[PDB]
Design a protein around this ligand. Sequence first.
Ligand SMILES: [Mg+2]
Ligand SMILES: [Mg+2]
Ligand SMILES: [Mg+2]
Ligand SMILES: [Mg+2]
Ligand SMILES: [Mg+2]
Ligand SMILES: [Mg+2]
Ligand SMILES: [Mg+2]
Ligand SMILES: [Mg+2]
Ligand SMILES: [Mg+2]
Lengths: 72, 134, 59, 194
Amino acid sequence: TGKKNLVVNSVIRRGKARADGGVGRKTTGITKRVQRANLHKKAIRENGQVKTVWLSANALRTLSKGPYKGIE
Amino acid sequence: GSRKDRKRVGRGPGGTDKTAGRGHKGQKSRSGAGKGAFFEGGRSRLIARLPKRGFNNVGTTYEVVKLSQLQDLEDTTFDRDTLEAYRLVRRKNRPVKLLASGEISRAVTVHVDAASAAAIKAVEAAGGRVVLPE
Amino acid sequence: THKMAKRRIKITGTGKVMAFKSGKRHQNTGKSGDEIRGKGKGFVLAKAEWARMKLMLPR
Amino acid sequence: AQINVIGQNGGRTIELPLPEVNSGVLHEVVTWQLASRRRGTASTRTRAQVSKTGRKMYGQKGTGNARHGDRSVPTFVGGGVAFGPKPRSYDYTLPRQVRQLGLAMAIASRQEGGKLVAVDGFDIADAKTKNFISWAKQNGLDGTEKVLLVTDDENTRRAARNVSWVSVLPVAGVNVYDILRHDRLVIDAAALEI
RNA sequence: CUUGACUGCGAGACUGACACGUCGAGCAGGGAGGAAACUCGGGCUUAGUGAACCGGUGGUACCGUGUGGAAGGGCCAUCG
RNA sequence: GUAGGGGAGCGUUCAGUCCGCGGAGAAGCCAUACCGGAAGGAGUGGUGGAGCCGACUGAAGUGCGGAUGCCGGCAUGAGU
RNA sequence: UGUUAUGGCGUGCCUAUUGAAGCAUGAGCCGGCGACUUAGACCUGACGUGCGAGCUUAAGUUGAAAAACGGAGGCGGAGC
RNA sequence: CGAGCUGGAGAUACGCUUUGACUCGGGGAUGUCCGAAUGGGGAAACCCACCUCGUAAGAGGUAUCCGCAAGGAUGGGAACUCAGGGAACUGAAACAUCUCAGUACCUGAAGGAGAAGAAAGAGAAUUCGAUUCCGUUAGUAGCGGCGAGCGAACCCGGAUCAGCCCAAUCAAGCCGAAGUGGCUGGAAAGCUACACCUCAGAAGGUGAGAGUCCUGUAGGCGAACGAGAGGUCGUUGUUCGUGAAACGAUGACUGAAUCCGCGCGGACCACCGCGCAAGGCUAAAUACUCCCAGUGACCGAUAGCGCAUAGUACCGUGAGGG
Ligand SMILES: [Mg+2]
Ligand SMILES: [Mg+2]
Ligand SMILES: [Mg+2]
Ligand SMILES: [Mg+2]
Ligand SMILES: [Mg+2]
Ligand SMILES: [Mg+2]
Ligand SMILES: [Mg+2]
Ligand SMILES: [Mg+2]
Ligand SMILES: [Mg+2]
């Protein structure tokens, strides 16, 4: 779980044989077709009192260049 | 009196009961009994293997108004788009178009969305006019 | 079923069925000249009876 | 050409349906009506699914002398039923012209015998049910027949309460069955009449 | 001597359950040989073959999503 | 005359209408030498102790010998 | 009508099959349970009714011992 | 309510009741132990403590989670609703994309309903104006090993219709009209001879078949208390399977304007036209049936729920079955 908004919660990932082409190949056709997940980065800073938690890279870039409801 | 009330003489037949019959064990003998898979279409029997593409569009479709209707009977009621509702040309959903079918002399003036060449010719030959919007 | 639409099962005024001629469509040609314009108009109705069952509503 | 109870004459209006009194149409209509009123409610656990049983049983081979999957099948006792009644409807739309033609033809089917129209339902004097018996008796109705009274005037119909003499169908709620089923039709109020 | 190994079409038949297949007078646009009648829309004939689908190439301009375009599609050839 | 198509019908339950029957006895059950082209239906007798034929129309959970089919009861093996 | 003696004739039923009295399947016996339905504004035919160059409504609204209202829409009406 | 009562109970004993019992409604009053269980432990209904109050008997407090405080939550609920997660047989007459289907299953949150909602929209008329729901458009437009198959939306007809804040009558109940004689019979409500009520003939009970014999019915009344942004990458949604793929949506990395400004109109550009995102709330039309009522061309004892009451007997270590 992150700082601001959302984390994890991911979707599937594919792969294609006869991949690429001359843009106007015969066709693309499919193989992979399986479900998958996503994670992100950890960091530690305090707000309102000394704390640690975890920090989204987006939230880290947010907190670094300014205090949006929090400090480092 | 409902007691005396009779049937339609041939509306209803009885249904088909396959219990009994004594020498009814229905359908086939073997082979393709019991299934819900029958399905009279399908893949490679002369449907595929058939060489068509074409191009699908199906655009604007006009309501056909026969001259043969307009001339001959009624009044020459001076149609416009108004009367068409009650004149038994009422369908809508589409614009209205006039074409020549029956050939007869009358004075008539019709307002439709479009019309054919020989229809124009036949409306003018017996005298009249056909209006179109810009 | 949605295949037979743009492809020709096409129905006529007499409730007959238009397929025509397949003789060679695109691949495999380079033989004669009237086979090529031999792309036709023609059909039998023996297999029309169950044909348009696929085209039934949007004939 | 029918005569009212109190006051003027009329019924020279309303040509009665042709051909005269066709019983087929009548049949179609009433049947349609009882099918309309028919209320589908069906208790069947038809499906092997609907009654309750745990589903794996004993064994497919080697037990000897049976071969069953479940205790809930139609060929068992206590299981589901093969093709049992479910809550259907059977209410449809009868073509309107045949409804009209129907009750018209009904009224007409009363032309080969007794029917009655009326004005002045004031002869009841409240209800009292007795003054209805009087009205009937002096109008020729001894209630040895079955009578369908059609009228407005709540007081006038409220006078007639019994399954013996009569039955009441108000404010032109006329029903082809309801008339053809009763012996005499008393049309009373000339509103939907003429 | 030459490009009928043509384009536009097909009266009427052979053959197949179907889809394929076969033969063909004659009409046109235009041709080639002969002086001429005329003959030729591949080879004395019967084998030398692949339905559909998805794409590659040339041509035509029909569709083309508010409209004028363009993308993509469609049609006539053809390629795997 | 087998699968298969066609026609007429018999019976059972519910339903509306009509005619009705029943403690001087209903349905059901039991016996029967009658009727009907068949599915079937009457007559009288014997049980029974509350209800029920017939006609007309309508609707079906509507007709069993088999499915090593389901439940139940009772046989065989055997006084072994 | 019941039973019987003798004569003549006489290869259970079902399924499955080229072919069954079969030494091929099934089944101890009787009772009861027990299998070609139902649904959709689907499609296509036969018959029947109502209107008919026109024919219908759907949701819903209002009455509801009752049915009326509801033209949004659907099908004819022109083919290529 | 006004003579009975002392539960199913068949049963003896003791009694209670017009100083209105019983029964029916309506609030309070007590409520052992367990269980979210919550002083502490625990193989649920048990074993051990502490701090106050004090005359013991006996009452009271002692879980964690939000908070100044008041206060709120932890649990439970048949189906219904939203969400996090997400099958396979099966179909394609084999099988990978597809189909099954976001179905089943698990999980989270909540109410009597939920969800959804107040245009950076639908859409091609310079039309429409929150949402949901039904009919319809329409098996159309479309998606697809262009196979099996999948399948919209706008218009239009209805149900119901609100936009507001903000950031610089129905329940106890009571009242109720009108028949006698003879007859068959064990017994009558049936037959019969005469008669009556009916804003009451709906119904059940009564020795058999019932308007007028009982309860009722039509009609009438009725209470203290009680209710009613953009991009790239990986991807995905909707008819959208990478297709020319727009747009919404995000996991990662990037992260512009702001009023001659900004997103959209299915690659893309101009024109033209609709529209103001990055903040919240928001009845009604809708779904379901644990429960109650009324009905039925629904069953009537192998039917109907499994049960004419039983999750009992019974089977299993158990989930479970029955
Ligand atoms: Mg067989
Ligand atoms: Mg065979
Ligand atoms: Mg020639
Ligand atoms: Mg393919
Ligand atoms: Mg048999
Ligand atoms: Mg022995
Ligand atoms: Mg021995
Ligand atoms: Mg598989
Ligand atoms: Mg398969």
